[PDB]
Amino acid sequence: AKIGLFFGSNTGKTRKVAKSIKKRFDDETMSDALNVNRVSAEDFAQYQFLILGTPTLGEGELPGLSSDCENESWEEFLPKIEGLDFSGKTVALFGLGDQVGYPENYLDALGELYSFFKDRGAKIVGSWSTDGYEFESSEAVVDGKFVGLALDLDNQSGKTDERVAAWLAQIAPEFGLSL
Ligand SMILES: Cc1cc2nc3c(=O)[nH]c(=O)nc-3n(C[C@H](O)[C@H](O)[C@H](O)COP(=O)(O)O)c2cc1C
Ligand SMILES: [Mg+2]
Ligand SMILES: [Mg+2]
Ligand SMILES: [Mg+2]
């Protein structure tokens, strides 16, 4: 497939969102939603286009064993790919979090993922307005916008599909999407 769709998850919400993205696209356009704990670095590296999802867990951390997840996740995956260059590749990110429960750390892990790929040369697309969210601080906010799609399936699950649909339309020119 042209676009690799990868996520990490501990209670399945990020997996559900990822599947809700893939259901919109055919198998030449997009890979099935793949948990990073099941992907090799070489397979991840094949894709010139990536859509990457993560929750924020612990407090402000990527999913993985150190944030008390059942299985390894993004925490243990990033070192496997940290020596790779993402220049010329296009990346869009989505984050899940709980803006009420974690008002000072909402979507922090989305910011960590953004930084990882930006520092390694990726072209990142898909920034998102902070309107309609209530929070105090987020490492995912850069220049007044979230660095990727912001979701909240604890407080705003009924907004997810509309948000995903609008975000996909926004990134469609960069990802060569037909909706
Ligand atoms: C122990 C724990 C810690 C969390 N920490 C944060 C946090 O720091 N920031 C945030 O935005 N959301 C936080 N959340 C909310 C989760 O990211 C949110 O519930 C998400 O939907 C979980 O996704 P998953 O089912 O894919 O694991 C936390 C949730 C739990 C259970
Ligand atoms: Mg097609
Ligand atoms: Mg297949
Ligand atoms: Mg190493």
What DSSP element (H or E) covers 3?
strand 3-7
Q: Cα separation of 73 and 64, whole Å? A: 4
Three-class secondary structure of residue 88 per DSSP: coil
Report CA 142 to chain centroid distance, whole Å. Answer: 16
Q: Cα separation of 90 and 117, whole Å? A: 10
The verdict on the CB of residue 60 being under 6 Å from ligand 1 is yes
| CB-side neighbour CA atoms (13 Å) of 70 | 5
| Phi/psi at 51 (5° precision) | -120, 120
Q: What is the CATH number of the domain that holds 174?
A: 3.40.50.360
Which one of the ligands is nearest to 7 CA? Answer: 1
Closest ligand 1 atom, residue 61 Cα: 8
DSSP 139: T
Count of domains forming the chain: 1
First to last CA, the chain: 17
Beta-carbon contacts of residue 32 (< 8 Å; ≥ 6 apart): 5, 22
Q: At what angle do helices 108-119 and 74-81 cross, to 10 degrees?
A: 10
Q: Where in the sequence is the domain holding 33, given as residue range(s)?
A: 1-179
DSSP 32: P
The verdict on the CB of residue 8 being under 6 Å from ligand 1 is no
From the number of C-beta atoms within 10 Å of its C-beta (0-12, 13-18, 19+), residue 119 rates as exposed
Is 14 annotated in a binding site? The answer is: yes
Contact criterion met (CB below 8 Å) for 24 and 50: no
Beta-carbon contacts of residue 144 (< 8 Å; ≥ 6 apart): 130
The verdict on the CB of residue 103 being under 6 Å from ligand 1 is no
Query: Which residues on adjacent β-strands are paired with residue 52?
Result: 6, 93
The verdict on the CB of residue 96 being under 6 Å from ligand 1 is yes
Q: Cα separation of 147 and 63, whole Å? A: 18
| CB-side neighbour CA atoms (13 Å) of 144 | 0
Q: Cα separation of 63 and 165, whole Å? A: 25
Three-class secondary structure of residue 121 per DSSP: coil
The verdict on the CB of residue 102 being under 6 Å from ligand 1 is yes
Give alpha helix (H) positions in the chain: 13-22, 41-45, 74-81, 108-119, 160-175
Given resolution (angstroms):
1.2
Closest ligand 1 atom, residue 17 Cα: 26
Q: Closest Cα to atom 27, ligand 1: which residue?
A: 10
